[PDB]
Amino acid sequence: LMKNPQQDSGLLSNSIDFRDQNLIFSNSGGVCTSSKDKIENYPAKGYPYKRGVKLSFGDGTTELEVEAGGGDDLYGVCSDIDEFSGMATVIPITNNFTGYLTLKKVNPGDKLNFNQHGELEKVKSVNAIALSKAHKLTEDLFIVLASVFGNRAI
Amino acid sequence: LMKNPQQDSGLLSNSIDFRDQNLIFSNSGGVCTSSKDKIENYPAKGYPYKRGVKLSFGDGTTELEVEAGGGDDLYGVCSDIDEFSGMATVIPITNNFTGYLTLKKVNPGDKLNFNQHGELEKVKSVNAIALSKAHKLTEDLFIVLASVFGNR
Amino acid sequence: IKQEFDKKVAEIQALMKNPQQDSGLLSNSIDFRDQNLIFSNSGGVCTSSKDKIENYPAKGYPYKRGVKLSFGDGTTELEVEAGGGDDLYGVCSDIDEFSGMATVIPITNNFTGYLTLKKVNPGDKLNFNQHGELEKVKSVNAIALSKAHKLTEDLFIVLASVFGNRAI
């Protein structure tokens, strides 16, 4: 629900090990990032963090915004949110992405697609392949490493 | 049918207003431009300016060129033209473009497709969404702000 | 035995991109035309500085072929192997044999260059097969810009431009 946890921790972190220290919700961006990636920023409608986003049009008084969604309305993938300005960082669907995305509440090689709420689910229109299994961060919060490369063909 | 108007105006322009000054036909490129965008150039066959283009092949003596077109042959979007060299600047369909494009003689949010002449029309195989109403520059020339983000 | 050895060397060197081979003479190629029709040619005829290029461990010999992702027992990371159809992931534009690393351009980025063809005139529609070879026609926008050039009794290359997916 938030990039940074709302409640402050009561304990320090044990910074000794180096394994399995990347399965956190505050892991913004992608696991493998190219210097030739196209990155945009939009006004955020809701909390579309780590979800497929779509274009949301108001009454014309205010500019275009982005909200979590999928299906035929999918426009990109949100990889970061600046909360002070409400700015959602979006990687366009034309550009391929590899990273941790929210999964609907799954094995490597299974084909995934974005549902109505911008959540990955097992399969049609979007090329997404899971590179790992679901990792549970909360009772309803599951993340999964996936590679999204364009849109499929009907 | 030229980016730069041929008939030079008889009056000086008044630079007093900062609103509604970009709704001209000589506004080449895009409104939102990324420094990592891929930009190609090709020989132009006709005037494909501000239209969707397709690859056209000749007899074989000369190289391939780009001509205004759509359908399943759509290759990219022509954003600029150098008239001296007849060189059309193309953004491939694999790259996403946001800018003013020619509309066939539509409200923000309407899905659009490219016709046989590279003109956007209201609706199948291209992701084009109108971001503004049709602005009429000439009695037959209409433009529209559209974001293209690939195929469907 | 040695003749069979030499025959296998010939086969594997024809398979390879730039095999090591000593020559008794200095071959002279003074003309500057049709000098680029070699198997050791660079990945792209027209290359942009904004192209996204990845590298992956290779399974088999996917050079100048369409590549797809493949997974094993999970002990080792995913690897690219020659393939096409609906499983196509990218195009292998280079290979480094010492490190066994295939340099690949994803299907989300348009590519133009010489690719392996099935054993064709310009302006024809091409599709990737199960082996990653191009064949005359589909779900990929691949168009041939030239005719098939034959370098070996089974090796054909063709100049092709591939730009994204083809809806419907």
The helices-and-strands tally (H runs, E runs) of chain B is 0, 11
> Counting runs of H as helices and runs of E as strands, what totals does chain A give?
0, 11
Q: Shortest Cα distance from A84 to chain B (angstroms)?
A: 23
Which stretches does DSSP call E strand in B3-104? 40-43, 52-56, 65-68, 74-82, 87-92, 97-103
**How many C-beta atoms lie closer than 10 Å to residue C68's C-beta?**
20
Structure tokens at B55: 């690859």
Chain A CB contacts of B109 under 8 Å are 55, 57
Residues of chain B with a CB closer than 8 angstroms to some CB in chain C: 36-40, 55, 57, 60, 64, 72, 75-76, 92-95, 124-126, 150-152
Chain A contact residues (CB < 8 Å to C): 32, 34, 36-37, 94-96, 108-109, 127, 129, 131, 147, 149-154
Structure-block tokens of residue B7: 């008939």
For this PDB entry, the determination method is: cryo-EM
Question: How far is the CA of A98 from the CAs of A35, A113, A132, C42, in angstroms?
Answer: 14, 14, 12, 27
Radius of gyration (Cα) for chain C, nearest Å? 17
Under a CB-based contact definition with an 8 Å cutoff, are residues A118 and A69 in contact?
yes
- For residues B101 and B81, give the distance between their C-alpha atoms in angstroms, rounded to a whole number: 14
Model resolution, angstroms: 2.8
Of A34, A94, A149, Cβ closest to residue C89: A149
**Opening angle at CA C145, ends B82 and B119, nearest 5:** 50
Residue C20 corresponds to which tokens in the numbers above? 């090591």
Q: How far apart are CA A73 and CA B75, in angstroms?
A: 22
Give the residue numbers in B contacting A (CB under 8 Å), as ranges: 32, 34, 36-37, 94-96, 108-109, 127, 129, 131, 147, 149-152
Cβ-based contacts under 8 A for chains A and C: 50
Q: Which residue of A has its CA nearest to B92?
A: A94
State the residue for tokens 């891929």.
B38
What is the spatial distance between Cα B71 and Cα B115, in angstroms, rounded to a whole number? 6
For C12, residues 6+ apart whose C-beta sits below 8 A from its C-beta are: C19
In B, minimum Cα distance to A72 occurs at B152
Shortest alpha-carbon distance between residue C10 and chain B (Å): 36
CB pairs < 8 Å spanning B and C: 47
Nearest to B36 among A38, A55, A93 (CB): A38
State the distance between the two ends of chain B, measured CA to CA, in whole angstroms. Answer: 31
Q: What's the CA gap between A108 and A130, in Å, rounded? A: 5
CA nearest to A108 within chain C: C71
Count the Cβ atoms, other than its own, within 10 Å of residue A10. Answer: 5
Task: Kindly identify which residue of chain C lies nearest to residue B64, measuring between CA atoms.
Answer: C145
Question: How far is C-alpha C7 from the geometric centre of its chain's CA atoms?
Answer: 24
Q: How far apart are CA B60 and CA B108, in angstroms?
A: 43
Q: Give contacts of B94 with chain C, Cβ < 8 Å.
A: 108-110, 163-164
* DSSP-derived secondary structure for B82-103: ETTTTEEEEEETTS-EEEEEEE
Cα Rg of chain B (Å, integer):
16
Give the closest-approach CA distance of B59 to chain C in angstroms. Answer: 10
Separation CA A69–CA C85 (nearest Å): 28
C167 and B57 in contact by Cβ < 8 A? no
Q: What is the DSSP string of A26-60?
A: T--S-SS--TT---EEEEBSS--TTSEEEEE--SS
